Design an enzyme around this catalytic site. Structure first.
Site, PDB file in Angstrom:
ATOM      1  N   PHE A  53       0.827  -1.203   0.000  1.00  0.00           N
ATOM      2  CA  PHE A  53       0.000   0.000   0.000  1.00  0.00           C
ATOM      3  C   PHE A  53       0.864   1.256   0.000  1.00  0.00           C
ATOM      4  O   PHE A  53       1.723   1.428   0.868  1.00  0.00           O
ATOM      5  CB  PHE A  53      -0.883   0.064   1.248  1.00  0.00           C
ATOM      6  CG  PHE A  53      -2.138  -0.762   1.177  1.00  0.00           C
ATOM      7  CD1 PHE A  53      -2.090  -2.146   1.257  1.00  0.00           C
ATOM      8  CD2 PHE A  53      -3.378  -0.141   1.113  1.00  0.00           C
ATOM      9  CE1 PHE A  53      -3.254  -2.893   1.284  1.00  0.00           C
ATOM     10  CE2 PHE A  53      -4.545  -0.881   1.140  1.00  0.00           C
ATOM     11  CZ  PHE A  53      -4.482  -2.256   1.228  1.00  0.00           C
ATOM     12  N   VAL A  55       0.421   5.474  -0.220  1.00  0.00           N
ATOM     13  CA  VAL A  55      -0.479   6.620  -0.287  1.00  0.00           C
ATOM     14  C   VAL A  55       0.248   7.964  -0.212  1.00  0.00           C
ATOM     15  O   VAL A  55       1.295   8.092   0.428  1.00  0.00           O
ATOM     16  CB  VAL A  55      -1.554   6.552   0.821  1.00  0.00           C
ATOM     17  CG1 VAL A  55      -2.444   7.792   0.765  1.00  0.00           C
ATOM     18  CG2 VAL A  55      -2.392   5.296   0.647  1.00  0.00           C
ATOM     19  N   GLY A  56      -0.315   8.955  -0.894  1.00  0.00           N
ATOM     20  CA  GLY A  56       0.261  10.284  -0.906  1.00  0.00           C
ATOM     21  C   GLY A  56       1.747  10.363  -1.198  1.00  0.00           C
ATOM     22  O   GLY A  56       2.202  10.108  -2.316  1.00  0.00           O
ATOM     23  N   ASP A 139       5.097  -3.344   4.070  1.00  0.00           N
ATOM     24  CA  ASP A 139       5.136  -1.893   4.125  1.00  0.00           C
ATOM     25  C   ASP A 139       5.831  -1.506   2.833  1.00  0.00           C
ATOM     26  O   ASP A 139       6.749  -2.208   2.399  1.00  0.00           O
ATOM     27  CB  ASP A 139       5.995  -1.405   5.300  1.00  0.00           C
ATOM     28  CG  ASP A 139       5.227  -1.298   6.607  1.00  0.00           C
ATOM     29  OD1 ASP A 139       4.125  -0.709   6.611  1.00  0.00           O
ATOM     30  OD2 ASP A 139       5.742  -1.783   7.638  1.00  0.00           O
ATOM     31  N   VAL A 140       5.421  -0.391   2.230  1.00  0.00           N
ATOM     32  CA  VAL A 140       6.040   0.042   0.976  1.00  0.00           C
ATOM     33  C   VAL A 140       7.466   0.584   1.135  1.00  0.00           C
ATOM     34  O   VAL A 140       8.317   0.329   0.285  1.00  0.00           O
ATOM     35  CB  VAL A 140       5.184   1.114   0.259  1.00  0.00           C
ATOM     36  CG1 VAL A 140       5.270   2.432   0.995  1.00  0.00           C
ATOM     37  CG2 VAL A 140       5.645   1.271  -1.167  1.00  0.00           C
ATOM     38  N   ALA A 162      13.245  -8.376  16.323  1.00  0.00           N
ATOM     39  CA  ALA A 162      14.595  -8.636  16.756  1.00  0.00           C
ATOM     40  C   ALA A 162      14.624  -9.890  17.598  1.00  0.00           C
ATOM     41  O   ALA A 162      13.633 -10.602  17.726  1.00  0.00           O
ATOM     42  CB  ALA A 162      15.115  -7.477  17.547  1.00  0.00           C
ATOM     43  N   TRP A 163      15.785 -10.166  18.183  1.00  0.00           N
ATOM     44  CA  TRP A 163      15.958 -11.345  19.022  1.00  0.00           C
ATOM     45  C   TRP A 163      17.237 -11.254  19.847  1.00  0.00           C
ATOM     46  O   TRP A 163      18.153 -10.503  19.511  1.00  0.00           O
ATOM     47  CB  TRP A 163      15.973 -12.614  18.169  1.00  0.00           C
ATOM     48  CG  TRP A 163      16.696 -13.760  18.808  1.00  0.00           C
ATOM     49  CD1 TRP A 163      18.028 -14.042  18.717  1.00  0.00           C
ATOM     50  CD2 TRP A 163      16.125 -14.779  19.639  1.00  0.00           C
ATOM     51  NE1 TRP A 163      18.321 -15.173  19.439  1.00  0.00           N
ATOM     52  CE2 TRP A 163      17.172 -15.644  20.015  1.00  0.00           C
ATOM     53  CE3 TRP A 163      14.832 -15.042  20.101  1.00  0.00           C
ATOM     54  CZ2 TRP A 163      16.964 -16.755  20.831  1.00  0.00           C
ATOM     55  CZ3 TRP A 163      14.629 -16.145  20.912  1.00  0.00           C
ATOM     56  CH2 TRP A 163      15.689 -16.987  21.268  1.00  0.00           C
ATOM     57  N   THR A 173       7.303  -3.960  23.479  1.00  0.00           N
ATOM     58  CA  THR A 173       6.343  -2.879  23.498  1.00  0.00           C
ATOM     59  C   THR A 173       4.945  -3.301  23.059  1.00  0.00           C
ATOM     60  O   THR A 173       4.368  -2.737  22.138  1.00  0.00           O
ATOM     61  CB  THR A 173       6.823  -1.732  22.649  1.00  0.00           C
ATOM     62  OG1 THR A 173       7.085  -2.205  21.326  1.00  0.00           O
ATOM     63  CG2 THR A 173       8.096  -1.165  23.237  1.00  0.00           C
ATOM     64  N   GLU A 231       0.822  -2.923  14.506  1.00  0.00           N
ATOM     65  CA  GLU A 231       1.811  -3.771  15.161  1.00  0.00           C
ATOM     66  C   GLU A 231       1.389  -4.311  16.524  1.00  0.00           C
ATOM     67  O   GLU A 231       1.808  -5.399  16.926  1.00  0.00           O
ATOM     68  CB  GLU A 231       3.160  -3.035  15.262  1.00  0.00           C
ATOM     69  CG  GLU A 231       4.364  -3.982  15.429  1.00  0.00           C
ATOM     70  CD  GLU A 231       5.711  -3.289  15.301  1.00  0.00           C
ATOM     71  OE1 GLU A 231       6.025  -2.409  16.132  1.00  0.00           O
ATOM     72  OE2 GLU A 231       6.464  -3.631  14.364  1.00  0.00           O
TER      73      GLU A 231
END
Length: 268
Positions: A53, A55-56, A139-140, A162-163, A173, A231
């Site tokens: 996706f 946009v703009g 994500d683009v 990560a890890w 988070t 997320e």
């Protein structure tokens, strides 16, 4: 009859996770036998889908880098349909695609990132479920750096942010407000996945998206708004619905050196 031992050998990366409790493999460089896998999937004639996706501002700054590199590195040697969702069909570039590739562009009211879960599902039902066996949503603002192959195919596929080694779930988070559906209690959770990438089979990805959009809605409908939008919900989802395959950080890296196999630049 494909055995996990036919293409995967966890003992090739001892210093990292290669098997999650629910026995799902964690794909890191050198643990997969892609040659075996290419032979395998070729006999089934599978087609992989990828929905990006833009946009703009993103279309001008990223859509092209994406497609170009996705063409050179994504599921090479297999049919692949590229699903382009943009808010302005004219700003989007049309690069030349290689053998077995094709795109399909759609216009979307630039009415947010969370609202993407909805459109993605609507299309899986509308057509994607019929055109591809697996589907990846990305994500683009990312760029492929090396072959991103079928060693990433799965029923439910999640990306590790990560890890380390036993990481204490408290310092992830996750969403902590209980009023949120993305809510994950302290001292709980397996890993912290990136929403930047996640895939599986159209049916599975429809549950992932359908599940998140509903949760995003509830919180929309309660004035609350999960910490990291998508997320949060996505990481809450792979908690309840443990993914069947986990990709290592080497498939969505923020920096730029080591063996990324794909980089998340996210606004320079």
């Amino acid at each position: 009859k494909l055995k996990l031992s036919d293409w995967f050998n966890p003992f090739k990366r001892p210093e990292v996770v290669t098997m999650t409790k629910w026995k799902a493999p964690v794909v890191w460089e050198g643990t997969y036998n892609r040659a075996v896998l290419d032979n395998y999937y070729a006999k089934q004639k599978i087609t992989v889908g990828l929905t990006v996706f833009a946009v703009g501002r993103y279309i001008e700054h990223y859509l092209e880098e994406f497609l170009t590199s996705a063409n050179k590195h994504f599921m090479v040697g297999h049919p692949v349909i590229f699903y382009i969702m943009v808010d302005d069909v004219s700003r989007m570039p049309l690069i030349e695609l290689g053998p077995l590739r094709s795109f399909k562009v759609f216009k979307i009211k630039p009415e947010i990132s969370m609202m993407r879960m909805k459109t993605i599902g609507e299309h899986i039902v509308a057509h994607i479920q019929h055109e591809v066996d697996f589907l990846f949503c990305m994500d683009v603002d990312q760029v492929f750096q090396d072959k991103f192959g079928v060693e990433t195919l799965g029923e439910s596929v999640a990306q590790l942010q990560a890890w380390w080694y036993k990481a204490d779930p408290n310092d992830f988070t996750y969403e902590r407000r209980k009023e949120s559906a993305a809510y994950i209690p302290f001292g709980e959770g397996d890993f912290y996945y990136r929403a930047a990438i996640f895939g599986g089979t159209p049916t599975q990805v429809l549950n992932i998206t359908q599940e998140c959009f509903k949760g995003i809605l509830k919180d929309k409908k309660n004035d609350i708004e999960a910490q990291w939008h998508d997320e949060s919900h996505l990481n809450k989802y792979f908690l309840l619905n443990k993914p069947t395959k986990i990709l290592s950080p080497e498939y969505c890296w923020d920096y730029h050196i080591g063996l990324p196999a794909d980089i998340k630049l996210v606004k320079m």
